[PDB]
Each structure stands twice: as C-alpha cells, then as structure tokens.
Symmetry: C6
Subunit: 200 residues, 6 copies
C-alpha cells in the first residue's frame, strides 16, 4: 500500500480549479493518444506507395508528392500533442518539488493564494496560445478538405501533370474530427479560466 504520498499531491493540485476542469480534461487521454495510436495511424500507412501521377518521366512522382505534402498530418498532430502536454508536466514537477521541499521543511525547522495560481494561469494561457497557433498554421497550409486530383507544376516535370491521392474521404473525415476535438479542447480550457477569474 503505497498510494498515499501521491494521493495528497493530486488533491493539492486539483484544489484550484473546478472538478469539471479535471473530469472533462480526460480527452487528452481517451480521445487524443488512443485515437492517434489505434485508428488514424493505419489510414496513413500506404501514403507514398499508392501516390501516382500520370507521366512517363522518371522521378516526377517524388517531387510532386513533396510539393503536395510538406509534412503529413499524423506527425503534425504528434507535434501538437507534445507541444501542448509540456506545460502541465512542468507545472506538476514544480508543484511536487515545492511540496517536497516544504514537507522536508516542517520536519527540519518545526521540531521545536500564491505563486501557484500565477504559474497555473501561465500554463493555461500557454496551452491556449499553442492550440490556436497550431490551428492557424493548419488552416494556412492545407485547408480542411482534400481533392482527389492535384495539379503539379514543378521541375523537372513537363508543364502540367496530374496526380491522384490515396483514400481522400477517410482522411477528410479524420481531419474534421481532429478539428472538432481541438476546438472543444480550446473552449473547455477557456471556460475554466473564466470560472477561476470570476471566482476570485
């Protein structure tokens, strides 16, 4: 039975916000890592092996596929998850080490509202900023639909060449799904901030 020194750590860190701010923030565990690990990875399996362009010329397929996709979507969502997860991790590390230093303190000098809310709201605004920045980068690069026919105009390919993607509809549905989950996570992060700021 060694689940006590960790039970108090979570009750101290979860005492700030509303309980709805924690019991609705499980979508980072059930809707993000699970969906990226299980289903949507296999849809991007045969990416380059099924891309085909209508040309006799050798080597045009590689440069046209490069111009179509600067960076595939699954690595993009992995970078989004990594760059969003980090402030919560450093916040938990700082809070746990401050708690451990004070737990060492009262047994080393007492044998005879603070900066935590500031760090908390800093982490929340950083999460919001990174989420809206990644959403704007995706809206600028790709849009939220994929056409089955792409027109390629790159060297050393002759004038205009047509290329056909692999499985566009399923990728469209999954792009829309990740967009909806990201927007819901954004609104959920701003709602608890409004709740805490109107509590004080």
């Amino acid at each position: 039975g060694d689940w006590s020194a960790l039970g108090k750590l979570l009750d101290k860190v979860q005492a700030y916000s509303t309980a709805g701010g924690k019991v609705w923030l499980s979508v980072l565990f059930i809707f993000r890592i699970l969906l990226l690990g299980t289903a949507v990875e296999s849809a991007w399996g045969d990416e380059q092996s099924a891309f085909r362009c209508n040309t006799q010329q050798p080597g045009c397929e590689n440069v046209c596929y490069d111009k179509s996709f600067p960076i595939s979507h699954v690595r993009f969502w992995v970078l989004q998850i990594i760059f969003v997860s980090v402030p919560t991790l450093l916040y938990l590390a700082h809070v746990f080490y401050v708690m451990r230093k004070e737990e060492k303190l009262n047994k080393k000098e007492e044998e005879l509202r603070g900066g935590l809310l500031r760090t908390y709201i800093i982490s929340i605004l950083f999460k919001s900023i990174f989420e809206v920045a990644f959403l704007l980068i995706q809206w600028y690069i790709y849009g939220f639909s994929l056409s089955a026919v792409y027109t390629c105009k790159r060297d050393p390919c002759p004038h205009q060449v047509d290329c056909f993607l692999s499985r566009p509809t399923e990728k469209t549905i999954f792009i829309i799904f990740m967009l909806v989950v990201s927007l819901v996570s954004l609104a959920l992060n701003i709602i608890e901030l409004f709740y805490v700021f109107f509590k004080g």
Copy 2:
C-alpha cells in the same frame, strides 16, 4: 495489499442495477476489444493492395476504390467503441470524485436515491441513442452484404468500369457477427433499464 479503497467503489457503483446488468456487460471486454484486436483486423490487411479494376487507364483504381469505400469498417467499429465507452467512464469519474469528496467530508466536519440514478439513466439512454444512431448510419451507407463485382462510374474513368473486391465472404460473416453483437448489447441495455424502472 491495496485493493480495499477500490473494492468499495465498485460495490457502491454496482449496487444500483441488477447483478445481471454487470455480469452480462462483460461483452465490451471479451467480445468487442478482443475480437477487433485479434481476428478481424487481419482480414482488412490487404485492402488496397488487392483491389483491382479492369482498365488500362492509370489512376482509375484509386478513385473507384474511394467511391466504393468512403470509410472502412474497422475504423467505424473503433469509432463506435470509443463513442459508446465514454459515458461509463465519465460516470465512474464523477461517482469516484463525489465519493472521495464525501470521504474527505465526514473526517473534516464530523470529528466532533439521488442524482446518481439521474446520471445513471442519462448515461444508459445516451449509450442506447449512440448505438442505434451508428446502426442506422451503417444501414444507410453500406447495407449488410458485399458483392464481388462493383460498377464504377467516376471521373476520369471511361463510362463504365468493373472492379473486384478482396475476400468478400469473410467480411460478410464478420459484418453479420458485429451486427448481432450490437443488437444483443442494445437489448441488454434496455432490459436493465426496464428492470430498474419497474423496481422503483
């Protein structure tokens, strides 16, 4: 020995319905995740690599396969499992945190039928609604049989083109099996609701 603080949590949450409502609801653990993970995933392995259409034209295979399958069945059942699992998870989280708050309560202020049934029946009706919605979407999109010959009439393919699927009979049997398991889960969810409503 640390299996006591979790033994009471399950006896409190399982005290509402009949024991048959729990000991028959193991099919989410034995018939859904096991069957999707072990057997039926390997049947959808060589999906695009064995699809073939009878045409000399380049790139017609991709668009005809896209028009045949907007979304493959295994990702559809994964989305069904995820969208059905979530209400039970949030119900357990809310009940455990209410129990933890009241366990903190009686040691913080006593040293000197409720909303749970409402949340329970809300979760059960949400499970039923999502199950019948997914079944109706599958009945509208695909039907419950697969033909070996498909007729494709999409650009830029010439007039009419024939395509042959890969392994239709085994996929037909597994579609029928998942349909039967979904219907049995639906009837099982409504039976305990009738039992609880006629208990009170």
Copy 3:
C-alpha cells in the same frame, strides 16, 4: 501479500469436480492459445500473395480464391476458442459474485449441493455442444485434407481454370493436430461429467 481472497475462490470452484478435471484442462492455456499465437499463425501469412491461377484474364484470381476459401482456418479456430471460453468465464463471474454477496451477508446479518452443480453441468454440456457443432461445421465445409490443384468454375472466368495453393502439407499437418486436440478435449470434458454423475 494479497493472494488470499483469491485462493479461497479457486478452492471453492475446484471442489466440485475431480482434480484431474482441472489439471488436465490446462490444454486451453498451453496447447490452444500458445500454438495459435506462436507457430500456426505464421503459416497462414502469405495466403493471398502466393495464390495463383493459370489464366490471362484479370480478376479471376480473386473470385477463385474466394470460392476456394469462404473463411480461413485461423479465424475459425479463434471463433472456436472464443465461443468455448465464455461459459467458464460467466460461471466464474456468477460464483464469485454469489460468494461475495454471501461474504457480505454473514457480516451483515450474523453479527448478533445446490444450484452451483446445475450451472456447472449446464456449462459443461454447452461446451460439449459447441465443440461438436464446430467440428461438424468444419467436416462439412472443408474436409481434413487439402489438394494442391483446385478447379475453379466461377464467373467471369472462362469455363475451367486451375489454381495452385501455397504450402498444403504443413497446413494439412496443423489441421490434423487441431482436430486431435479438439477430440481429446471433448473426451476429457465428457469423462469428468461421467465421474461427477456416478459420484452422486
């Protein structure tokens, strides 16, 4: 040390039959899941990628392979294992919850031969019925040998076409092995039933 509340559960459930009924029923753990997971799965690896028919016509290979194999053997044995495992699991769940209810009972009202054999023999006869039904379905569908040459007579293939399977001898040996293990499991299940019925 938390292996006491589980040690009594197994001694209560194993008290009914002979000890030989349990120490010989480990073949579901050593001969079924191990053999299907380790060796015989890799033999059915290159199933469709090595099937070949002797025709110039496109798309005849898929329909002839479909007519040869309605459902491959490894998914069939997986369905057999799943449909045989379930009565033991529900029997253990019912017995454990009855034991837990009575363990709660004698501490809630005593502070101041039964239905189990019926459920047991019901589970045993269900196991026997499912085993002999799966064996008869396999004897009706495939037989217990495989020829290297198959004659295919399906549309849109011309008149008669010959196809050659991949690795028939190893699959024949493994089919014979699973048949022998299934028959031994059947006789082993009926022997303990005779022993218990002649005990009483």
Copy 4:
C-alpha cells in the same frame, strides 16, 4: 513480501535430484526460447519470397517448394519445445496441488520416498523418449545438410526442374547448433537419472 509460499514449493521439488540437475537445466530458458525468439526466426523470414526455380511454366514454384519442405524447421523446433516442456509442467502442477492438499490437511485434522519419485522418473523417461523420437524424425526427413540446388520431378512441371534455395549456409550452421544442444540436453537428462538410481 509474498515470496515464501513459493520458496518452499521449489525447495521441495528440487530436493529429489542433484543441484547440478537443476542449475544445468536452465538451457531450456537461455538456449532454447531465447535463440528461437531472437536470432534464428529472422533467418527463416524470406522463405517463399526468395525460392526460385528455372522454368517458364506458371505454378511450378509452389509445388516444387512444397516437395522440398514438407514442414519448415522453426515450427518443428517449436513443436519439439512444446512437446518436451509439458511433463515438467504437469509434474509441478500435481506436486503443488498435493502439497496444497496436505497443507490444508494438517490444519484440518491435526488441530487436536513415495509416488513422487515414480512420477519424477516417468517424466524424465518421457522427456528422453520424445527427444530421441524428434531427433530420429528429423534425421529421417531432412538430414543435417542443405544443398543449394534441388531437382524437382513433380506434376505438372516438365520432366526435370532445378530450384535454388535461399541462404543455405546459415541454416546449416543453425541446424548443427540445435542438434548439438539437443544431444547435450539428452545426455544431461540421462546423467541425473543415473545419479538418482545409483543414489538409492
């Protein structure tokens, strides 16, 4: 700390033979499962995909490869390991359940050289019989060398056809290695039997 109820079980079962009979019988754990799992499995990876015969005729490759290899060596060694491991497992199960019944006994009726050596020598002679039977079957089927050129004379291939195997030298070395390990295990099993029989 729950490693006491298992420490006595091993001291009781290891009290019969010499300590060298146990500390040298770790080759079933370090030399058999490790070597089959790690190194020698990858050598039989591209078995059928690199087999090639010198003929224009379609479908001759499959039947000539079938006639060359009735059953590949890795599944053969897996069957050898499984059919050798089982007597030790049933011996441990019987000894542990007899020990548990007698541990229940002296607390249920005493509150106010035997059959084990027979079962032990039966298990040892069964291990020896199965080892020498598998070695004789391998000596009858394959021999202990592989030629790079095979002559195939099977229907419907024309008269005589030549086929070339993939990587024969590495497979020869591993066949010789498994033969040496099997012979050493045989001599090691018979030495402890002689030691125990000359002890009594």
Copy 5:
C-alpha cells in the same frame, strides 16, 4: 511500500545543482527518446525503396545512394543519445555505491564538498564536449538542408547521373528541430555550470 531507499538517493544527488538544473533536464526523456521513437522513425522508413536515379545501367543506384548518405540521420541521433547518456549513468552508479558503502560503514564501525563535485563537473564538461563534437561532425558531413536533386559521379556509373531523394522537406524540418533541441540542451548544461561555479 519500498520507495524510501531510493528517495534519499535522489535527494542526495539532486542537492548539488539548482532545482532548475533537474526540472529542465527532462527533455532527455520527453523530447529525445519520445520523438525518436514515435514520429521521426517512420519518416526514414522507405529510404532505399524510394531512392531513384535516372539511368539504364544496373547497380548505379546502390553506389549513388551510398555516396549520398554515408550514415542515415536516425542512427546518428541514436549514437548521440547513447554517447551523451553514459556519464550521468556512471555518475549515479558511483554515487549510489559510495552511499551504500557508507551506509554499510556507519553500522559496521559506529555501533559503539568533496570528490562528488569533481566527478559532477567532469560529467558535465564531458556532456558538453560530446554535444559540440557531434554537432560539428554533422555540420561537416551534411549541412542543414537537403536538395531534391543530387549529382552522382561514381564508378561504374557513366559521367554524370541525377538522383531524386524521397521526402526532403519533412526531413529538413526534423533536422532543424533536432538542431534546436541540441543547442537548447547545450545552453542549459552550461547555465547550471555557471550557476554552481558562481555559487562557490
């Protein structure tokens, strides 16, 4: 509960530097092993299978790809992680064994600033030296950009041959990312060294 004999070991080793030197040195766990294991490995999947040069001559592709890539980037970053991780590991091993010897000491002879900072700064300067050496080797070998067209002038290829790489943009982005993480790790390692040297 066995997390005490390890809790003191970490408080002794983390007592030297600032807490920011440890809570910011988690990037070896969250940004290095995770990113190399999950995302960037799959980008270097189809390396040789998509490399193509524009020549009729057999075997020119292998030597031109060899001259383009002496060693691929993922094995290079793996060697960097391994050669950077080792001084911290030997430092922890030496400190733990010195602590264990002194813990044995005061119970064996007392029943009736030191070399650690030197070893610490030695490990830190070794980490800095290896990081800047690997960065200079990568700047000398490859540069920090990749062109889609490579000119190959090696035997036995005729005069000048052109080759096209696979997915250059995504690899460029990941090269820039690993460069930024390495520079940040370098500055972070030198900052705590300045902090400790100006503390004393």
Copy 6:
C-alpha cells in the same frame, strides 16, 4: 518491501572484485543489448532484397550472395553475446544456491577465500577465451572492411560476375564500433583479474 533477500546476494557476490570491476561492466547492458536491439538491427533489414548482380542468368544472385555472406553479422554478435553471458549466469546460480543451502544450514544445525574465487577466475578466463576466439574467427572470415563491388565465381554462374552490396559504409562504421567495444571489454576483463591477483 521485498528487496532484502536479494540485496545481500549482490553484496556477497560483488565483495570479491573491485567496485570498478562492476560499475564499468554495465556495458553489457547499455552498449551491447541496447545497440543491437535498437539501431544496428534496422541497418541489416533489406539485406537480400537489395543485393543485385549484373547477370541475365536466373538464380545466380542467390548463390553469389551465399558465397559473399556465410553468416550475417547481427546473428554473429547475438551468438557472441549469448556465449559470453552464460558463465556469469551459472556463477550467480551456483553462488545463490550455495548461499541458500547455508542459510538453510545455520537454522537447521545451529539452533542449539574458498572455491568461490576459483569459480570466479574460471568464469573470467572463460569469458576472455570466448571473446578472443570470436574476434579471431571474425578476423579470419570477413576482415574489417567491406567493398562495394564483389567478384563471384560460383556455379552455375558464367565465368566472372560482379555484384553490388547494399549500404557498405554504415555497416563498416558499425563493425568498427563493435570491434572497439569488444576490445575495451577484453582489456576491462583482464584489468580486474590483474587487480585481484595482485591483491592476494
């Protein structure tokens, strides 16, 4: 808390040699199994699928690749690790069982420098002999460099045939690295032997 009966076993076995003999012998755990499992395995992935010889004749590629590589390097290093690891394992097993027999002894008969150094130096000299034997076998078979062009003169290939290997430079670097690690392990094993022999 069950890490005491194992803490004394390691302090008894590590009491013989210097602490540097143990804290520097972690390279079997950090530099051998990790490097073989993670990086260098993927370099030998596409071995046979990229080997190509310049001939129109069928089946010459297999015999020329066989004559080039009698046994690939990764299985060779796996055999080296297995044949080096075993003396330490049997030494630990013998020491632990002697310690367990004497721990049973003083509680069974006392209720009212030795052979260990000989076994230790035997294990060390066996490790040295096996290391230098494997290094001499590798120096005799392959040398420590690989040429991109191989000349093959085997039946039934016509007179002289040229073959081109896949990725020779990276394999050269990894061969040199494993050679350096093996030589460092050899010198490290002989240094502690000199230290112990000059201690006594």
